[PDB]
Amino acid sequence: MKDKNVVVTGGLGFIGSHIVDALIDDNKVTIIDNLSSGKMENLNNPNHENLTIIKEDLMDADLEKILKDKDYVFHLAALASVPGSVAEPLRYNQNNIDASLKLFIACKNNNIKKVIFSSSSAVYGENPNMPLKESENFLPCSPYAAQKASCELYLKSFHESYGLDYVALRYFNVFGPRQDENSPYAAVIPKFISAILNGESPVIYGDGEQSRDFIYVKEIAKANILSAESDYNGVINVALGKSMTINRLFEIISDVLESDIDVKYLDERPGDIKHSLADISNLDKISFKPDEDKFEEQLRETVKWFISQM
Amino acid sequence: MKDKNVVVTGGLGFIGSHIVDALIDDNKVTIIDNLSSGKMENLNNPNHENLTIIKEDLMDADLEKILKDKDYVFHLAALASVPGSVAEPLRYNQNNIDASLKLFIACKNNNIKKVIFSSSSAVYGENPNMPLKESENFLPCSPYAAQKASCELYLKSFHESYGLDYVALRYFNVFGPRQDENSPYAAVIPKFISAILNGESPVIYGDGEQSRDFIYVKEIAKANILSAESDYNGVINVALGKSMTINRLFEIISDVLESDIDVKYLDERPGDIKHSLADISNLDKISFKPDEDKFEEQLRETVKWFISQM
Numbered sequence: 108m109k110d111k112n113v114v115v116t117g118g119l120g121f122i123g124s125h126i127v128d129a130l131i132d133d134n135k136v137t138i139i140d141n142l143s144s145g146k147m148e149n150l151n152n153p154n155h156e157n158l159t160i161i162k163e164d165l166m167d168a169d170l171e172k173i174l175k176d177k178d179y180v181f182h183l184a185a186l187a188s189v190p191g192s193v194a195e196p197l198r199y200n201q202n203n204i205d206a207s208l209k210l211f212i213a214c215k216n217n218n219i220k221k222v223i224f225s226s227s228s229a230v231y232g233e234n235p236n237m238p239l240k241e242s243e244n245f246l247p248c249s250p251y252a253a254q255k256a257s258c259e260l261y262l263k264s265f266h267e268s269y270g271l272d273y274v275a276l277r278y279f280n281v282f283g284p285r286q287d288e289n290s291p292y293a294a295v296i297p298k299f300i301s302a303i304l305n306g307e308s309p310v311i312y313g314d315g316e317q318s319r320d321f322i323y324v325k326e327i328a329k330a331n332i333l334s335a336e337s338d339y340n341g342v343i344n345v346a347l348g349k350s351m352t353i354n355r356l357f358e359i360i361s362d363v364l365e366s367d368i369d370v371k372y373l374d375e376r377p378g379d380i381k382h383s384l385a386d387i388s389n390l391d392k393i394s395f396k397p398d399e400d401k402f403e404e405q406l407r408e409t410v411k412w413f414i415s416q417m
Numbered sequence: 418m419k420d421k422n423v424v425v426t427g428g429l430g431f432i433g434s435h436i437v438d439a440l441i442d443d444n445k446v447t448i449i450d451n452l453s454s455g456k457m458e459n460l461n462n463p464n465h466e467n468l469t470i471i472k473e474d475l476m477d478a479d480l481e482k483i484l485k486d487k488d489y490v491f492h493l494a495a496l497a498s499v500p501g502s503v504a505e506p507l508r509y510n511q512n513n514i515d516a517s518l519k520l521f522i523a524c525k526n527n528n529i530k531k532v533i534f535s536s537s538s539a540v541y542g543e544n545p546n547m548p549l550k551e552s553e554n555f556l557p558c559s560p561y562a563a564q565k566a567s568c569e570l571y572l573k574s575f576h577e578s579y580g581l582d583y584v585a586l587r588y589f590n591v592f593g594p595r596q597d598e599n600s601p602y603a604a605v606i607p608k609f610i611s612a613i614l615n616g617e618s619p620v621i622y623g624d625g626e627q628s629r630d631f632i633y634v635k636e637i638a639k640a641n642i643l644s645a646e647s648d649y650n651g652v653i654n655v656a657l658g659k660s661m662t663i664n665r666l667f668e669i670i671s672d673v674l675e676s677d678i679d680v681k682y683l684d685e686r687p688g689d690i691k692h693s694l695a696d697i698s699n700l701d702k703i704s705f706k707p708d709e710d711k712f713e714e715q716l717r718e719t720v721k722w723f724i725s726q727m
């Protein structure tokens with residue numbers, strides 16, 4: 108992508124910062140981010156000539172004005188937490204549905220060429236029909252999952268009502284540089300890496316045979332950019348279509364870190380589904396083929412990032 | 418249902434007033450209604466000893482307090498318009514998602530035994546797989562349809578997260594006494610009846626071969642009450658599972674009114690789907706069998722109501 112003027116909501120966050128990095132040399136980029144979880148220092152160059160940063164909540168921003176003469180909108184801003192949403196459903200509704208809708212209204216009023224929306228495999232709930240096809244019904248188990256599904260439904264309705272073109276991307280388990288490790292809720296790869304680097308035993312919730320479809324953050328960024336350039340409108344899973352158990356993950360991370368620190372086993376967390384696996388056939392719709400044998404290399408890059416932060 | 422204390426949101430409206438009528442002799446009923454479209458005079462007895470009316474927007478009401486010690490909540494309050502939602506998606510979002518969520522939060526915090534939610538066959542969009550089963554995916558064509566679907570998804574998530582029991586009822590084409598005829602958007606049965614009573618030719622948008630699954634408002638009220646009493650949680654179509662063309666409807670209404678006024682034919686309305694038909698198998702889940710040969714009787718009751726309003 109070259110010579111476009113794009114908006115990246117949540118562009119100071121984990122995933123959004125990697126999208127900004129990939130676009131910024133050849134495109135004007137306006138980030139809208141309230142710093143609720145993102146950081147200026149997540150950007151490779153936060154002073155880049157092509158960059159604009161608007162430090163504001165989407166609910167307050169004049170999105171009708173900001174989106175004038177923009178080409179594409181990448182919507183990553185969200186309160187991105189399943190357990191957080193259970194504790195605070197109304198606040199999550201404001202950030203995840205209401206703000207998204209305000210953005211989508213400004214998109215259609217400004218004739219934005221495409222919206223690329225960050226959804227989640229959480230919308231599937233506990234579905235045994237793996238590998239999970241996009242045609243599965245929604246089975247949201249948390250307010251967060253209902254919110255992402257609601258946004259997908261609004262996008263469908265905006266396509267029909269106003270001709271707004273969009274891709275909704277259902278991410279599976281994203282990992283990589285700049286992912287949070289500090290929250291009680293933080294993802295397993297950051298927790299395993301952080302624990303080992305701090306000389307502490309990590310923990311597994313359950314027996315460790317649970318499995319996930321992990322996908323590297325730079326691949327998510329590529330999928331976003333390819334979706335913007337595609338003529339396809341609709342919903343696409345973004346993953347590798349491969350399973351890894353948490354036991355196996357721990358072995359691999361321990362090998363990468365040359366670590367003899369052992370893992371502890373605790374009871375299962377309520378709400379954790381046992382197995383999650385994407386069907387990624389529809390990645391053909393955006394001409395995306397993720398790298399299928401680069402997990403160790405990606406983990407090494409992630410570890411090096413966490414080392415640099417100590 | 419006897420000796421319960423219930424809340425009916427939108428209880429001064431078309432459908433809600435019939436639910437209030439059916440419950441009020443044997444139960445305490447609190448209506449919450451902002452009079453945006455409902456009327457005091459829709460109730461059979463607006464001064465009934467068991468009645469309380471709170472004239473307030475759901476967004477402003479202290480629902481946490483109002484729902485203390487209530488048994489059931491019937492949620493009918495909404496901005497109930499497909500074309501209105503296209504014109505004003507944010508305002509419709511506030512009334513249809515945000516207010517519903519505030520209510521559902523108060524329901525789960527007060528351990529309400531059941532929520533009975535008014536959804537719509539609009540959530541199916543233009544789906545040729547008739548008769549339409551509840552398992553069909555959502556295909557919302559308007560912000561309204563997305564909003565009703567979002568509410569259904571929130572209810573599912575609240576069942577999983579908090580144990581809130583619910584039934585979402587997908588109404589097909591409701592008709593009967595107290596339905597609005599004055600809006601530009603008003604439903605076909607009121608428009609046909611009102612036109613003929615005013616000595617004016619009604620209009621058909623298209624060729625009249627379009628068909629709908631019409632369902633009488635008193636049957637909707639019964640389905641609501643049976644759903645409250647049922648152990649079932651989930652989503653159920655409420656209809657007859659029968660089709661009637663708009664041409665045939667006009668013939669029947671003209672016969673009932675002994676009218677020689679002819680109908681005019683105009684171009685199709687954008688957004689109108691041609692055929693809509695419910696699969697009503699899952700009405701067995703709430704032990705409801707609607708009357709299958711009472712259409713003329715129901716139309717006569719509707720006509721007599723419109724006559725009484727002249």
Ligand SMILES: CC(=O)N[C@H]1[C@@H](OP(=O)(O)OP(=O)(O)OC[C@H]2O[C@@H](n3ccc(=O)[nH]c3=O)[C@H](O)[C@@H]2O)O[C@H](CO)[C@@H](O)[C@@H]1O[C@H](C)C(=O)O
Nearest residue numbers: 187227228229279280292293294295298310311312317379
């Ligand atoms: C925090 C995070 O990134 N979570 C994301 C991740 O969930 P989840 O699959 O629950 O991710 P995990 O917590 O990393 O759990 C994955 C597995 O790892 C075990 N585990 C986790 C932590 C630990 O210390 N020990 C341990 O054993 C755990 O029991 C589970 O089996 O993937 C989902 C998509 O597939 C996202 O919806 C979800 O939220 C994102 C933000 C969003 O939607 O915006």
Ligand SMILES: CC(=O)N[C@H]1[C@@H](OP(=O)(O)OP(=O)(O)OC[C@H]2O[C@@H](n3ccc(=O)[nH]c3=O)[C@H](O)[C@@H]2O)O[C@H](CO)[C@@H](O)[C@@H]1O[C@H](C)C(=O)O
Nearest residue numbers: 497537538539589590602603604605608620621622627689
């Ligand atoms: C106003 C109203 O009650 N509309 C409801 C009705 O829609 P619709 O099926 O569009 O209902 P119609 O407008 O009565 O249209 C039905 C058919 O009749 C023709 N027609 C309509 C008017 C007229 O003058 N002449 C004429 O020919 C028209 O072209 C169509 O084929 O049924 C749906 C459920 O099946 C509801 O979602 C919808 O909104 C409710 C509020 C809600 O969800 O809350």
Ligand SMILES: NC(=O)c1ccc[n+]([C@@H]2O[C@H](COP(=O)([O-])OP(=O)(O)OC[C@H]3O[C@@H](n4cnc5c(N)ncnc54)[C@H](O)[C@@H]3O)[C@@H](O)[C@H]2O)c1
Nearest residue numbers: 117120121122140141142143144145164165184185187281
């Ligand atoms: N990390 C994952 O595994 C994962 C999986 C599935 C979906 N997602 C989705 O991808 C997107 C990005 O997630 P992430 O992991 O980068 O999360 P993140 O918290 O790092 O990024 C979200 C960014 O949005 C900003 N933000 C939040 N609310 C805002 C508001 N109201 N106005 C303006 N800015 C706001 C935050 O400050 C942050 O920089 C989210 O929509 C998330 O739900 C992530």
Ligand SMILES: NC(=O)c1ccc[n+]([C@@H]2O[C@H](COP(=O)([O-])OP(=O)(O)OC[C@H]3O[C@@H](n4cnc5c(N)ncnc54)[C@H](O)[C@@H]3O)[C@@H](O)[C@H]2O)c1
Nearest residue numbers: 427430431432450451452453454455474475494495497591
């Ligand atoms: N009429 C139909 O054919 C049909 C079909 C499918 C679904 N529904 C649904 O059934 C329910 C009732 O529809 P109806 O036809 O009786 O509509 P209606 O407009 O007659 O009733 C809605 C009632 O809610 C009140 N209201 C609206 N917004 C409110 C708010 N924010 N706070 C408090 N009160 C509010 C109105 O004053 C009105 O009395 C709605 O949820 C509607 O979407 C109706």
Ligand SMILES: [Zn+2]
Nearest residue numbers: 316317381382
């Ligand atoms: Zn297993």
Ligand SMILES: [Zn+2]
Nearest residue numbers: 626627691692
């Ligand atoms: Zn036909």
